């Protein structure tokens, strides 16, 4: 019959777990509220965009980011939970990099933000490792036939970001202007930075 267990509403179960622990003095005052603020306000792909724009305008930093990602990120003070050992992977005219956690959802939280529903989906977890070109295509990114795709499966403690290619038409842009076109999806690797017409 392949039946599923009858369950109380998820909100009731989640708050039950909170109340059971809190009622036993195991949750410090303002603890979950503090985490919610960190997750919503601090952990953000704006941080990864800042790192990319710096790398694009500063060859010395670019080299540091690609050789010791952790150190480069630390310079900005952006190390944190699920982002303690950082590797940045470089897109090239012949290579497109893409990140997944096939086993769960592992993501460089502090610099990419918490993963989106789609990244944590069974569809993405199952398919991108095996058919990344078709997956990106379906998502709206056409990777040229003469460009290799490399998928990084986040299976241990390395936390990844993609350093995308800098698009033509951005020559001389400020770091702020560049940051604007480096989206969360560019950092994950499923999108290429876009220059307006």
């Amino acid at each position: 019959e392949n039946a599923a267990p009858a369950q109380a509403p998820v909100s009731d179960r989640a708050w039950a777990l909170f109340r059971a622990l809190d009622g036993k003095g195991l949750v410090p005052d303002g603890y979950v509220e503090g985490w919610k603020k960190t997750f919503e306000e601090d952990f953000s792909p704006r941080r990864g965009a800042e790192l990319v724009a710096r790398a694009w305008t500063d060859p010395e930093f670019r080299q540091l980011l690609l050789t010791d990602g952790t150190a480069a990120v630390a310079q900005y003070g952006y190390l944190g939970p699920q982002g303690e050992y950082i590797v940045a992977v470089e897109d090239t005219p012949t290579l497109k990099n893409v990140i997944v956690c096939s086993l769960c959802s592992c993501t460089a939280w502090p610099i990419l933000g918490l993963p989106p529903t789609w990244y944590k989906s069974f569809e993405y977890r199952a398919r991108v490792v095996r058919e990344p070109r078709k997956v990106l295509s379906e998502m709206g990114t056409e990777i040229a036939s003469d460009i290799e795709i490399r998928v990084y499966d986040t299976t241990a403690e390395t936390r990844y970001m993609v350093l995308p290619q800098r698009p033509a038409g951005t020559e001389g842009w400020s770091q702020e202007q560049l940051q604007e076109i480096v989206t969360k999806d560019c950092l994950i690797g499923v999108a290429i930075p876009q220059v307006p017409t």
Binding site: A14, A16, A20, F39, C104, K120, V129, E131, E148
Partner: protein, 212 residues
Amino acid sequence: MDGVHDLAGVQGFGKVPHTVNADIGPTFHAEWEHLPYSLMFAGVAELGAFSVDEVRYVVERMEPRHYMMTPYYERYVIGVATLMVEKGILTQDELESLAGGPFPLSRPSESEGRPAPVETTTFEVGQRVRVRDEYVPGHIRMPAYCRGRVGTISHRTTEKWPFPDAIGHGRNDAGEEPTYHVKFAAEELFGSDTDGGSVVVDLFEGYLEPAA
């Protein structure tokens, strides 16, 4: 653990529910969604009751149909609650009483785990390695698509971490190992039935052996 969570390479799924740069909305789509991670950190950092590895494993231990029908954040509510009961901190009775209804949990572990292996090799960038052809019923950070397959070392980490197969069961013998970015050709993993180039898997030293 060869569970339904080991999804890479499974066929039959539909479209990824996203178009690039589409609005994903707020970080949390319901008022409870911050609770699983925050209560996990209370357990890990404040109580010292379990590791993050035990959280991954308890989610792997959801009954398989239960795993498949449960949304992401809810799996972690179930997982963290299960660990709190297994560690003797909470009871299922009090969870269900407070919830006002059923709160089924992950299944008990069927493995005690395994220690970090004593015999391993320090590998260098460019070296060819094979993923050990081993079956582990408890927690392991090796997706089955790479078991027994051969790849090249692209990175050896400059830090070391406890062996997941041990710490994921709360064992005292997890030691510490570096991990290796191992690059596999797509055809090594999926033969002709792939449209990719290469796949890089971040593998603990204890999962590897010299190639041939």
